[PDB]
Amino acid sequence: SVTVKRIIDNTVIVPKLPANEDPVEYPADYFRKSKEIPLYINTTKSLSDLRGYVYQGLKSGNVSIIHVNSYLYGALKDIRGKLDKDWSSFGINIGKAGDTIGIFDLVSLKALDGVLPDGVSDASRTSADDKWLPLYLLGLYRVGRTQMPEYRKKLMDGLTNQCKMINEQFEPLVPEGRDIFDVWGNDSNYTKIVAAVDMFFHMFKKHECASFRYGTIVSRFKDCAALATFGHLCKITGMSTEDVTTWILNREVADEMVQMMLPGQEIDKADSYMPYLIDFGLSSKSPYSSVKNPAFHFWGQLTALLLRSTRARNARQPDDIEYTSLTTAGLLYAYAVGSSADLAQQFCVGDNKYTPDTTNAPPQGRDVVEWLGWFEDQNRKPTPDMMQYAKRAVMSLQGLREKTIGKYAKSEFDK
Amino acid sequence: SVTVKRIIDNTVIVPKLPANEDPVEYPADYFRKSKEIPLYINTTKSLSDLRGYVYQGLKSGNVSIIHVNSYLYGALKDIRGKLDKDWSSFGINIGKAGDTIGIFDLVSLKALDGVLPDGVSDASRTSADDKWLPLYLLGLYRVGRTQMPEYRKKLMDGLTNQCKMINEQFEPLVPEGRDIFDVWGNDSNYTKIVAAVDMFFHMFKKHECASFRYGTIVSRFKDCAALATFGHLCKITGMSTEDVTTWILNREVADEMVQMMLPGQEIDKADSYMPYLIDFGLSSKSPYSSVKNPAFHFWGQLTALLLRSTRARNARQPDDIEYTSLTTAGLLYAYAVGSSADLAQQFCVGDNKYTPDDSTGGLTTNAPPQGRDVVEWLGWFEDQNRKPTPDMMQYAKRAVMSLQGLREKTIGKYAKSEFDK
Amino acid sequence: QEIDKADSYMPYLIDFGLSSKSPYSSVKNPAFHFWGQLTALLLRSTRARNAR
RNA sequence: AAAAAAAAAAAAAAAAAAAAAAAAAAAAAAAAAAAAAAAAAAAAA
Numbered sequence: 001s002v003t004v005k006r007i008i009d010n011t012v013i014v015p016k017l018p019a020n021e022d023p024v025e026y027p028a029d030y031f032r033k034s035k036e037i038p039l040y041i042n043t044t045k046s047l048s049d050l051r052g053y054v055y056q057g058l059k060s061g062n063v064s065i066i067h068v069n070s071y072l073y074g075a076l077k078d079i080r081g082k083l084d085k086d087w088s089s090f091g092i093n094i095g096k097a098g099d100t101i102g103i104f105d106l107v108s109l110k111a112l113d114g115v116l117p118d119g120v121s122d123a124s125r126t127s128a129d130d131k132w133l134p135l136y137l138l139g140l141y142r143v144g145r146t147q148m149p150e151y152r153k154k155l156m157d158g159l160t161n162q163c164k165m166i167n168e169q170f171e172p173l174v175p176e177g178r179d180i181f182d183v184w185g186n187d188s189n190y191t192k193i194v195a196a197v198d199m200f201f202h203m204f205k206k207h208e209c210a211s212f213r214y215g216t217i218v219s220r221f222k223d224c225a226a227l228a229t230f231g232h233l234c235k236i237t238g239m240s241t242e243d244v245t246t247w248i249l250n251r252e253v254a255d256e257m258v259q260m261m262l263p264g265q266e267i268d269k270a271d272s273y274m275p276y277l278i279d280f281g282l283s284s285k286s287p288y289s290s291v292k293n294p295a296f297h298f299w300g301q302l303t304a305l306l307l308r309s310t311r312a313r314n315a316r317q318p319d320d321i322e323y324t325s326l327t328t329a330g331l332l333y334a335y336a337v338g339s340s341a342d343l344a345q346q347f348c349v350g351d352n353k354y355t356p357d358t359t360n361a362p363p364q365g366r367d368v369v370e371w372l373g374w375f376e377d378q379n380r381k382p383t384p385d386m387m388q389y390a391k392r393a394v395m396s397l398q399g400l401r402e403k404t405i406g407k408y409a410k411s412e413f414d415k
Numbered sequence: 416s417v418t419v420k421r422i423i424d425n426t427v428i429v430p431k432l433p434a435n436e437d438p439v440e441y442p443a444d445y446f447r448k449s450k451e452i453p454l455y456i457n458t459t460k461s462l463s464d465l466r467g468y469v470y471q472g473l474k475s476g477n478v479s480i481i482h483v484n485s486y487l488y489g490a491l492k493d494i495r496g497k498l499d500k501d502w503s504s505f506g507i508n509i510g511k512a513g514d515t516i517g518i519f520d521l522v523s524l525k526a527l528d529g530v531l532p533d534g535v536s537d538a539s540r541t542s543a544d545d546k547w548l549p550l551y552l553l554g555l556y557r558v559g560r561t562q563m564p565e566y567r568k569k570l571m572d573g574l575t576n577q578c579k580m581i582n583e584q585f586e587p588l589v590p591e592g593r594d595i596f597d598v599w600g601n602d603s604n605y606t607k608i609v610a611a612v613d614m615f616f617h618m619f620k621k622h623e624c625a626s627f628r629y630g631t632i633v634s635r636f637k638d639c640a641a642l643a644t645f646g647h648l649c650k651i652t653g654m655s656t657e658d659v660t661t662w663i664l665n666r667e668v669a670d671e672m673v674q675m676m677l678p679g680q681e682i683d684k685a686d687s688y689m690p691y692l693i694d695f696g697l698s699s700k701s702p703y704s705s706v707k708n709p710a711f712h713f714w715g716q717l718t719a720l721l722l723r724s725t726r727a728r729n730a731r732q733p734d735d736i737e738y739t740s741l742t743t744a745g746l747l748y749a750y751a752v753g754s755s756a757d758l759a760q761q762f763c764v765g766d767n768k769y770t771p772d773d774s775t776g777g778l779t780t781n782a783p784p785q786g787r788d789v790v791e792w793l794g795w796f797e798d799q800n801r802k803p804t805p806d807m808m809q810y811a812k813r814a815v816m817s818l819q820g821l822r823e824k825t826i827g828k829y830a831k832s833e834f835d836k
Numbered sequence: 837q838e839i840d841k842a843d844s845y846m847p848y849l850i851d852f853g854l855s856s857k858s859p860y861s862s863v864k865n866p867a868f869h870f871w872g873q874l875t876a877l878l879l880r881s882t883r884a885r886n887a888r
Numbered sequence: 889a890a891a892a893a894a895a896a897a898a899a900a901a902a903a904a905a906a907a908a909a910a911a912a913a914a915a916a917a918a919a920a921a922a923a924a925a926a927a928a929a930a931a932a933a
Contacts, residue, residue, distance in 0.1 A: 148912035238737030268431035308738035323880035341743035346669035
């Protein structure tokens, strides 16, 4: 099939179609360029000052990102945090035995010239400062990324978090529109700050100010949905990462799995940079994204859904994937895991179930090959019970959002 | 399966995935550091005073936790309480024979410098003091932890409790939001106080002021839900702790059970510190929590639910657990316990049911097992091609149909959907 | 014609006025457009649902 | 009389799409919208 030809007149034709570039970009394969995550923050000038440029700047539609940036640098040099262990990543040392370090031993710079208010926007603001203001500011990263009454859900609670040994009201005017400060997202250095705040308090989980991760948290594995629906599939099938992996039954799902699992990227690593590849700008097209792993994302979720997952219910149904092979392979894996439970006596009193005491009855366990065999044995077309299993998984599901694998499954199966 | 490889091009791949730290932390394995539960209470200055700093501080959005803390220390030195028995825990002596002791023989300190009002908030408040004000204050720990019209339920009654023998009325303004004083929770020393008040009155259950446990009670086994749904499963299957244990049929449920049952932690102990591991800060990630025991929590409740438990109805359905093996193993245990009751003559008059009659019969086959032995049932289940039977799934659908008012994301709502249709 | 080409002019044949009747259009490829979408639709396509 | 898509200028074609996205998932701790104790027919001269 490298070479197609029309039959009646017997002329060639080259079916070609619009290319589709943007390769992925891995964390590691970027520290092969630079060894530092440059955080340009400019006005290393007064903090007492900057604290004001932002309190006032926020109670109105205009506060410069460049200012909030610099404000955060100011509030966040709680050089607190004693590395009880070591800490490196991708070559980058960060601190060895017990070394005392702060949120920014992740390589600071300083940039350009333009900055708004003069000397003092107002003397009002005391150091009811770090206490919350940064929290609140970082928390707007989280709010900015969203779109439905979750925005007001997210703000309204990402605003009872500054009522924590503070007390207060709530600032800035317009609800949302992904517009009011949803631009901070677009700011290379802002993202770098939240990414650092999280990566830091992620490490020093017990810190007093660790409460700050409230908004800074949606940064960890930002754009790594498929990576995370992998881990969820595993957890929801109770199966091991490797055994789940064998259950991948489509070239372009395995292609993506291969792309995700690429080594020396610190995926699995305790406290690595990788989770923040996107916000630290180590990558501008993450290889763990739903969108670069559409087939994997669909399958893994559809499967988990069938296996009673609450999450998957609402996972988006990626477009331009082969739906009618991904679902089949999902159904099967779901069926396998589903029908044939994992029951096994765990405790006893000298007495336990030594277990080694029909035609076409589904396979004993969860071996891919046992099941593939069984399926081929099924003329390669999903069986009545399994399709019933599927219809039992999805009927009774209500409140399904359009274009989710949830709504997909229910339509594919309940009728 | 340590080593996976792609087939067509035959290259390796290492399926790895984001790690997941926060280990648990046990009570015991903390007194291997310190032998004291340090209650930093700073302003050991006047009480008549502090009683005011809080009465007024509360009738308004601003009262310092540091103040309530110190106020409680003041009101709660009812050094009352005669240890009729002994009393130790984790090495810590607390009082031997006849020893007379009070709520704070649990190791007090004193801290920093900042404190709000000057000399006198207002001379108003008499010693209509301990009588309730502490109760009320402690009661707000309980209220703070919550989220639905239970808040107003909980306050509205955790406020007819100060109308007791004292008859003194309701206070601050805003309903809730987990915000108004729901921050006292975050206070290391506050929690330590309520934890001590409970642990104490828990011991001296008959004390006059024991009425104080009203709010201080949600502290005992705070973050130990799986531990408690274990006990409930037991109670609800009438089975013994050990026989219930054998009925655990999933690696990760047993792993959790093992983690829970870890010895020398005083779980089972009369009046131990363990129940308060969280609030005394003996632990910052309790090993008895629903969340560190997700599979155990699910199973145990789902099962209990099936066995008619009223509680389980509303237990949350933990995420990222294997739902379709936990339910199977739950259904099975439920079925076992359910179908085959526990009937046996208990009393008589010289005449009783000798039960071993020549047990030869007709249902010569596949009828579910006589009793509740795991192995008898496992066998039977394997005998069932390892797929839950019609009656047992009917038993399940009888358990859950007719259940109404099920909350979303509870094992209740789960079971009804899994079974009623 | 550089259809498949990375960054070619072809995608803009219309707007660059390189063409005033594009050979890739639904309208000059009515049968192909129908078939391909109808098919895709059957194969669960979300897009095709709304193709004219 | 003349007519006959309440067709149509073309060009057109997802009431698709900036990029990045992807549970309208999440500080963490939790987890019966259980629970002072005592009780518990919203039973009773």
